[PDB]
Chain A
């Protein structure tokens, strides 16, 4: 997260770290058994680390749980990173407590101008902001006109832009898969951009509100 601040510990209790040797993507706990992340973060088995604030220190709050199933959206497209959403089923349910709490799925799509929070342990492009401690940033959703003007012909219905066209504040590498939460609902998943925090290149996010049908039917299993 570039241009943000260290989160109050456990203020984003849905935030998870996906780890396979080291932190490589974030995710969001949506109930005791399932995590939502980005489809490009796919690995066939991952360890999900919950209750984290500083990922390099054991603090006592952590739960580390292996995945049992990692399911990419059927229409994910790696060429253009379209439909970039994935579900991870935990091999055992998370214990919900002060440190670990799910985030609600959206009841409707949030309109442009809504203020949201994005968080993660990715690159901060700063000598003073430590990416091992969870960083937080407040970003507005941008209109489709601004988003498509920044990235001509690249923005699909499964994507939205959020951030600042002036640059300076953005998500960055190592934040993929993490939450964009707006008024207590998971509206976006960190997905892609041209660099990080560059003028005229706001971050692009997977639009969760159009995936409610697939998310809730898949979390039912078979």
Chain B
């Protein structure tokens, strides 16, 4: 799950970069 360390708000996984997922708190990780 290659996930870059940028802070990014998300509602769904598709908002995130690479293989990051939208974690419960509304941010990619």
Q: What is the interface of chain A, defined by CB distance below 8 A to chain B?
A: 22-25, 38, 40-41, 78-81, 84, 122-123, 154, 171-177, 190-196, 203
Contact = CB atoms under 8 A, between A and B. Distances in A.
Interface of B: 1-8, 17-18, 27-29
Contacts of A22: 7
Nearest to B8: A24
A98 to B, nearest CB: 28
Contact of A40 (B1, B4, B29): B4
B4 A174 contact: no
Contact of A81 (B1, B4, B28): B4
B5 A23 contact: no
A176 to B, nearest CB: 4
Contacts of B29: 123, 173, 195-196
Contact of A25 (B1, B2, B6, B27): B6
Given A78-B17, A81-B18, A174 B5 contact: yes
A24 B7 contact: yes
B1 A191 contact: no
B4 A192 contact: yes
Contacts of A80: 2
